[PDB]
Amino acid sequence: SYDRAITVFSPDGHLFQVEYAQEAVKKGSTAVGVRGRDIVVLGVEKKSVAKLQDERTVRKICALDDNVCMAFAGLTADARIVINRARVECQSHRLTVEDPVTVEYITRYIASLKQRYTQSNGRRPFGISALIVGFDFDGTPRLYQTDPSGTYHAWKANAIGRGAKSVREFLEKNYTDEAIETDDLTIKLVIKALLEVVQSGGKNIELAVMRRDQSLKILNPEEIEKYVAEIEKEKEENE
Amino acid sequence: NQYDNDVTVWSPQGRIHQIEYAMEAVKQGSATVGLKSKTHAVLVALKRAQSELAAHQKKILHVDNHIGISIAGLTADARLLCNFMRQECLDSRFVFDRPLPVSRLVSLIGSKTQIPTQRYGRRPYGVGLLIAGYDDMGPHIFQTCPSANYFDCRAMSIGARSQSARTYLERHMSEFMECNLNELVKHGLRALRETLPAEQDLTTKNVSIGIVGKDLEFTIYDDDDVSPFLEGLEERPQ
Amino acid sequence: SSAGFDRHITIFSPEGRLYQVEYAFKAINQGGLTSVAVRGKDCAVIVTQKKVPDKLLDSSTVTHLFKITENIGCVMTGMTADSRSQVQRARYEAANWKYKYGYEIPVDMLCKRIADISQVYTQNAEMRPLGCCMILIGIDEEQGPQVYKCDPAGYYCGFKATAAGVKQTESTSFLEKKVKKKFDWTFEQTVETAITCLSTVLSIDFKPSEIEVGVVTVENPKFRILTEAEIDAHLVALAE
Amino acid sequence: SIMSYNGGAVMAMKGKNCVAIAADRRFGIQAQMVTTDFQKIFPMGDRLYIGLAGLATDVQTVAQRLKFRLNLYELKEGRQIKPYTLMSMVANLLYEKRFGPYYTEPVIAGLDPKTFKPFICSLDLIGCPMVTDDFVVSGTCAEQMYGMCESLWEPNMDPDHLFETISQAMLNAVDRDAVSGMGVIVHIIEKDKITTRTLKARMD
Amino acid sequence: SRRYDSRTTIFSPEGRLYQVEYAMEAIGHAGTCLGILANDGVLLAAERRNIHKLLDEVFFSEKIYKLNEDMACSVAGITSDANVLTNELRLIAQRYLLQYQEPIPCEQLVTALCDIKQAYTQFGGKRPFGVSLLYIGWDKHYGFQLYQSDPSGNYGGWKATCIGNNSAAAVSMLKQDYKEGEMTLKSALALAIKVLNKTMDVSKLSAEKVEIATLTRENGKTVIRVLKQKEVEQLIKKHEEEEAKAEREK
Amino acid sequence: TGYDLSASTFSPDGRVFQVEYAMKAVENSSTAIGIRCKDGVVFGVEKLVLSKLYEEGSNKRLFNVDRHVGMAVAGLLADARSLADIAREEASNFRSNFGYNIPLKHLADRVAMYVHAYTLYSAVRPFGCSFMLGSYSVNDGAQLYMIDPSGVSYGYWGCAIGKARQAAKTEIEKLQMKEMTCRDIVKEVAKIIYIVHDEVKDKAFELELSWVGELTNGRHEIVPKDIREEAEKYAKESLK
Amino acid sequence: ERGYSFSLTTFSPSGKLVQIEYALAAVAGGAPSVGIKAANGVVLATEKKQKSILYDERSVHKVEPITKHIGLVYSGMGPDYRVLVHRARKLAQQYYLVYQEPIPTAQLVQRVASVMQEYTQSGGVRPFGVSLLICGWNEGRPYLFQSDPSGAYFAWKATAMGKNYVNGKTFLEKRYNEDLELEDAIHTAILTLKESFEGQMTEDNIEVGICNEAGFRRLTPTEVKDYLAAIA
Amino acid sequence: YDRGVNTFSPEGRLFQVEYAIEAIKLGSTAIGIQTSEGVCLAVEKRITSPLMEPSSIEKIVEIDAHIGCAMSGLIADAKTLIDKARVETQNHWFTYNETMTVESVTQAVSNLALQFGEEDSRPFGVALLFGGVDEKGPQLFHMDPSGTFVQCDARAIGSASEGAQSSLQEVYHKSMTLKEAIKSSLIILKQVMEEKLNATNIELATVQPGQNFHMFTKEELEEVIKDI
């Protein structure tokens, strides 16, 4: 009935220590992600550089294989172990079976690793939540998410971090039944969704796309500054 | 109440309460009655329904060609001791090429359930075994307990409200050594009907009867062959 | 000063104390016994009473004098069950010396190895620290006779006159009053002081059937337990 | 034999205040050469080298394991290693593979790190150390190297005549061997500097 | 038996960590370390604790630990817990050189330690490391670098670094007086003697209360210069003139 | 109290209450006595019928450890069964390693050290049993032993374990047991059981008598009291 | 056992380790000791009083050698002292089997402090209650180190451990200097040991070991009687 | 701490096993009905977002080509049960060249549900319904985290399982047909759920003797809803 063990149930049937892991995800930076027609896209917010450090070591988006991406939340220490482990599995799968790894296979591995890591006492569960995006499974663009309980799950648009309930409510009135083709439009959808940031500084947005055939493409803060300009410009014409 | 947490902790009165609590788990299951003649050992149990249309949960289960056991208590420790029970029987068939003596099988169970009643990290087995058998010296009725005190007996009834069955057996235990296979069974199921509230009746779908005999392999009957046994009974004396 | 679990397990308290070991020092005192060892000469004497409260209880299966090896004997105080397990390690590890090293173990080296076993029970937790005490005697070549004493804390020392049991503070006060003058110790002086010190602390003037005498001497270096008859021979000799 | 699978020759020689060490250059399988630039002399700190000969697998393997243990030693202690300490270190590493032994025979040469005192020693394939005062040799063509060094060695020699002695010893002994040759490299070290020369040898 | 349970691994009801927040508070009650990049070097500065006049200091290095061949590290926190890390950290860099025969490239050394430091916050009820420590070095791929270890396992690559409740106000000076792009050694050495004048509250800046080690890439060697006490003196006397100029503009 | 959960902790005066608690669980068990004559050992157990469905010789407390050694347990019956299997297994190793029958003085030492080990650690509890050990040999005579839950083991001439421990040995000691034959002892054991508490607070009981000595040629077995029935014919004569 | 393996030491909310600060209290409540590094050797001296007139003084020793040039004293509890002594003996021979050379005193303290480190962090055990003073004359210069139950270590010119160490802190600061001989160092080591001793100091109440460059040596009561023979 | 992983009550069961039954009650509902023509099955998806993909939530999995499944309670622990339940039917085919019966599947499944503790963890939080057609016709079973394994004729679990089982006993009789039982089931579904009963909230699974394969309906389910 208490709240200081993981093998205990509540009298109404809860696992509060797994539920306390999901609170630690909400203290993280927000990241969103949609799938397009052919080109997928995701982006992170809340960079907040502190004027005196290099910024290639604050990497929050990474690639597991040559065709699958990753974006997380929570605390950055536990995220490094999960990323470093999943690189081995998507590489060792290629050895035993000569296919490339599907996006559905690697998320079952991360969820099953977070599954068995919950059950035994003295193993503090991973306080992260991941987003796995890859147009890998034979021209089919997909994006999934995880959960600290260990439930891999598929969305078509997603938001995590501090204040995802505002963005997930924003995306339901924004993601049209019209599937947004002309992939700069889909990036403009992400850039407009990320424009509903907690402060919306405009320069604290890091977006990364993938056109389903290339490698990962980090956008630069001059092309990304060009897309933020047409957002307020087309919004001025709506008045 | 501060001594009432582990199996390891003795009380200031000398009574370990965790063993005393596993006795209470035996009373949660239904009643079951075992008895024997000179030639035939019969144990009869009472099924319990879960819902109106679900099947009734079984009680009597086969072990070997000369041993069958009844059950009362947790179904977790039921199949856990059963798998240990079946393993020891076929080892004597494999090594010695004889069936086990029934008496020294039960001493293996008392050694089995002793260790989780003393070391920390494992609960006692809440279970209510009644054992019928044939060694070279005839039929046997045994009972066990979660305190690992196995008892030889000539008639026994354990489970919920099973005292009323025991009072029936004491005033008829002299009659049991002489009767044949037939009324020995319906001496036994006259005892189960006092472990019932007086408004319902012992039907076909809620009772099981297992018989092992001197020339008879242990056989479990259920729901269709109980009707040759349920004939020839009187109503309840109300 | 109960802080954390310092009254229960072997951890440090404030002010550097630790209480479970100094609870064991008066875990001897529930035995109700007193033992005396004396080194004065080319010999060494153990004396300890027995207590037989039952006629049904035997007489030979009571004696606390325990023969470790042929040249080493010991006496045990404290509770009986922890005492006899302590003697099992002493008998065992003395024979490992003879097997590994090819000669007889010194009485000094044995009391170290016993005290180091009592160390780990003090150091590690969840392991009960054996509330009993051991006193040894034996002859060492080119060193004379010795008396050693090992604590439940693992502290050992070696000294001339030894009291253990209930009445240390009364007996050791008497032995310093006795051994301050270097009188001649002629193996009858050694027994006479060993008897009459205990005879004044307990104030009994006892029958020959309550005590035992363990002995070792450089004329017969074997450990030797005295007979009921010859205990009476020393007893009437001091009857003045 | 397994020692005769690739060939090799390592020679060290003690001078007055200096010490010299030399080896061949040929790498090859039993009769077919492969290359003529195979390193067999490895620096272990300043003014202290080591030479390896035998099976070319264990030449490269032991030289990496010994470098592994050396750098951990020179960080727990601020000082550098003494030449006696290295000899005890190598003999420990070889004796651990007592029954699975490495097929190599090292030769250690170097000066004292504090004084100027030279040092030479060589070991067996299981780690029996052996210090001398004149020369040590190892390799397949051992007996040819003993015949040259017993006649040409002098007690107190300048770095000029020490260079000419170990040159004439290595050139004449290796040309009598079949599976050794294709060039000879010579390190001559001293208190002030380190000189490395390569000699004009028969390439047949 | 079961009732002797230490926590060490349990989330808050709000979602924060129990011991990790406590361990970062002890580092504020420790010594002071910092470092700054240059275009052609990198340096470290340390504060001497327990400078009583009956010690020896014959190790020639107390906060600095030359660890691979071209990297060193400062240290802050529990001193006795730090010796487990540095003996481990020297052996990670050395088992790499056995494997590839090329020195460790100055980042994946840090991730190799930080995954060990993280792992005591995961499985196994044990005490975490109460040690934060710095990193200086040089590689083929990026050159001169600084890194910042944490008890949580998080690291970052900085250009001017920090110890906390001891010296968090130095970064406010470092954001004010570190010019970007040009950061050469004599400009950097004059900067650090000004910073330690503020944070280390010893008046007149006794030279035996500080310790400075530098690193310069020189002709293919990457020397690590633990500079001696004679040139700490002229570094102070260089700062002594800067007091006299500071009143001329009044 | 508040110091008495684990068996690995001391009290503030220096004892262990978990050993103290387990001793008086044996006190609530029925009385079983033992007595030895000049050429054998005779056991005797007061055993009470549970209700009626006991089957006349079930769950007996007279065990049979070796060819010439058996037990007379009292206390928790299931705990004594596992403890008896230790003694059965211990005598087999002595047979296999030394080639002859186990001496009873050595057998009690091996068991009591095993009982001692459950009095130290927090993971296990002490046993709730106490028992007797009787044997007979031509080179050693008859011996009779006694083991408490703490592990203290030494020899008696007569003993009793149960509720009436004091109330039975009050009248054991008025027997001249040093010169009686064990066939005379069997009818004398019968009255001592029958004197104390036949059916006062209980309903019914049944007598069990084990039997080892020179008349059995060193074997240990139950008496033939189905033969001659002389126990109850002679014990029930004490009604007047 | 069950196999628990949980440590007994955790951080306070202030950030301090509570049990290690308690173990240092047991160190300060021990027998006093003093160590002085002189120009030619190191002097160790301790204060050994028996509780009675019965105890033999030739049985137990306080100044204890490790190698033939390394000695070691303590101030704490007697029984925990003998563990790390026997530990440091076996540890010194493992150096000698590898490198064929007697271990330097700086390298010995590197490894002994890691042993005392291991009982703090590991599971279910408490730390020591013994601080040490380690001496030796390796490679000309002599050395004098101190370790503590925390696992740290230092390098002293002259220091004191045990009871009244703050008095010997002040007295050695006023008495010692840069250089003396060994004989001057023993003179000032008894004079600071006479600060907190009993009424009578004999050849048996103190116990002194030295470090010549010829090796480690503890002194017999013949010399200590003749050294305390009215030389202060 | 508060009647932990291995500690009896003063009266009855373990409370952790008792609390495991309560964790099923927050799960989604599910109904399976055994009929002599075959076993039908139904479940509710409980989709939260439109961006949330509907078919990523599975409730009916394929254990074997003639054995279905249905789950409730915790989602995460049920993937452990389905994994070895697929394996141990496949081990049986490897060593016997025959299909494992439906009853003897859950014997092996219930052997692992009662292994919790420190012997070589917590109990599971998931109930199951197994439908299958073996040689004894169609079968329908039910298990629980206590391992109390039993056969049912028509069972409903999850949230609102009490009100479903009361309403279910009115409509059931012995001579049902499969086309009758499917529309008889979903009437009970929309009376206990709250959203509009459409083709996106529920899914079906029917196994037949002659149609061992295809334990599924796919947008023929749209025809069934408009006919009720």
From Swiss-Prot, chain A:
Glycans are attached at S129. PROSITE patterns: PROTEASOME_ALPHA_1, PROTEASOME_ALPHA_2. Phosphorylation by ABL1 or ABL2 leads to an inhibition of proteasomal activity and cell cycle transition blocks. SUPFAM superfamilies: N-terminal nucleophile aminohydrolases (Ntn hydrolases) (SSF56235). It holds the Pfam family Proteasome. The modification N6-acetyllysine is found at K226. Disulfide bonds: none annotated. It is found in: Cytoplasm; Nucleus. The modification Phosphotyrosine is found at Y152. SMART domains: Proteasome_A_N. The keyword Kinase does not apply. Keywords: Acetylation, Cytoplasm, Glycoprotein, Host-virus interaction, Nucleus, Phosphoprotein, Proteasome. One of its GO terms (biological process) is proteasome-mediated ubiquitin-dependent protein catabolic process. Transmembrane segments: none annotated. GO terms for molecular function: identical protein binding. Induction: Down-regulated by the ribozyme Rz3'X. Up-regulated in colorectal cancer tissues. It comes from the Eukaryota. One of its GO terms (cellular component) is cytosol. Belongs to the peptidase T1A family. NCBIfam families: PRK03996.1. Component of the 20S core proteasome complex involved in the proteolytic degradation of most intracellular proteins. This complex plays numerous essential roles within the cell by associating with different regulatory particles. Associated with two 19S regulatory particles, forms the 26S proteasome and thus participates in the ATP-dependent degradation of ubiquitinated proteins. This is Proteasome subunit alpha type-7.
Curated annotation (Swiss-Prot), chain B:
SUPFAM superfamilies: N-terminal nucleophile aminohydrolases (Ntn hydrolases). GO terms for cellular component: centrosome; cytoplasm; cytosol; extracellular exosome; nucleoplasm; nucleus; proteasome complex; proteasome core complex. Component of the 20S core proteasome complex involved in the proteolytic degradation of most intracellular proteins. This complex plays numerous essential roles within the cell by associating with different regulatory particles. Associated with two 19S regulatory particles, forms the 26S proteasome and thus participates in the ATP-dependent degradation of ubiquitinated proteins. It comes from the Eukaryota. Keywords: Acetylation, Cytoplasm, Glycoprotein, Immunity, Isopeptide bond, Nucleus, Phosphoprotein, Proteasome, Ubl conjugation. The gene is PSMA1. PANTHER family: PROTEASOME SUBUNIT ALPHA/BETA. One of its GO terms (molecular function) is lipopolysaccharide binding. InterPro entries: Ntn_hydrolases_N (IPR029055), Proteasome_alpha (IPR050115), Proteasome_alpha-type (IPR023332), Proteasome_alpha1 (IPR035144), Proteasome_asu_N (IPR000426), Proteasome_sua/b (IPR001353). Coiled coil: none annotated. SMART domains: Proteasome_A_N. Belongs to the peptidase T1A family. GO terms for biological process: immune system process; negative regulation of inflammatory response to antigenic stimulus; proteasome-mediated ubiquitin-dependent protein catabolic process. It is found in: Cytoplasm; Nucleus. Glycans are attached at S107. This is Proteasome subunit alpha type-1. The keyword Cytoplasm applies. The modification Phosphoserine is found at S107, S174. Pfam families: Proteasome, Proteasome_A_N. There is a cross-link at K112, K205 (Glycyl lysine isopeptide (Lys-Gly) (interchain with G-Cter in ubiquitin)).
Curated annotation (Swiss-Prot), chain D:
The keyword Acetylation applies. The modification N-acetylserine is found at S1. It is found in: Cytoplasm; Nucleus. CDD domains: proteasome_beta_type_3. It holds the Pfam family Proteasome. Induction: Up-regulated in asthenozoospermic sperm. The modification N6-acetyllysine is found at K76. One of its GO terms (biological process) is proteasome-mediated ubiquitin-dependent protein catabolic process. Keywords: Acetylation, Cytoplasm, Host-virus interaction, Nucleus, Proteasome. GO terms for cellular component: cytoplasm; cytosol; extracellular exosome; nucleoplasm; nucleus; proteasome complex; proteasome core complex; proteasome core complex, beta-subunit complex. The 26S proteasome consists of a 20S proteasome core and two 19S regulatory subunits. The 20S proteasome core is a barrel-shaped complex made of 28 subunits that are arranged in four stacked rings. The two outer rings are each formed by seven alpha subunits, and the two inner rings are formed by seven beta subunits. The proteolytic activity is exerted by three beta-subunits PSMB5, PSMB6 and PSMB7. (Microbial infection) Interacts with HIV-1 TAT protein. Non-catalytic component of the 20S core proteasome complex involved in the proteolytic degradation of most intracellular proteins. This complex plays numerous essential roles within the cell by associating with different regulatory particles. Associated with two 19S regulatory particles, forms the 26S proteasome and thus participates in the ATP-dependent degradation of ubiquitinated proteins.
From Swiss-Prot, chain G:
Keywords: Acetylation, Cytoplasm, Nucleus, Phosphoprotein, Proteasome. It is found in: Cytoplasm; Nucleus. Its main location: cytoplasm. Induction: Down-regulated by antioxidants BO-653 and probucol. Down-regulated in response to enterovirus 71 (EV71) infection (at protein level). SMART domains: Proteasome_A_N. CDD domains: proteasome_alpha_type_2 (cd03750). Phosphorylated on tyrosine residues; which may be important for nuclear import. The modification Phosphoserine is found at S5, S12, S14. The modification Phosphotyrosine is found at Y4, Y22, Y74, Y119. It comes from the Eukaryota. The modification N6-acetyllysine is found at K68, K169. One of its GO terms (biological process) is response to virus. SUPFAM superfamilies: N-terminal nucleophile aminohydrolases (Ntn hydrolases). It holds the Pfam family Proteasome. One of its GO terms (cellular component) is extracellular exosome. Belongs to the peptidase T1A family. The 26S proteasome consists of a 20S proteasome core and two 19S regulatory subunits. The 20S proteasome core is a barrel-shaped complex made of 28 subunits that are arranged in four stacked rings. The two outer rings are each formed by seven alpha subunits, and the two inner rings are formed by seven beta subunits. The proteolytic activity is exerted by three beta-subunits PSMB5, PSMB6 and PSMB7. This is Proteasome subunit alpha type-2.
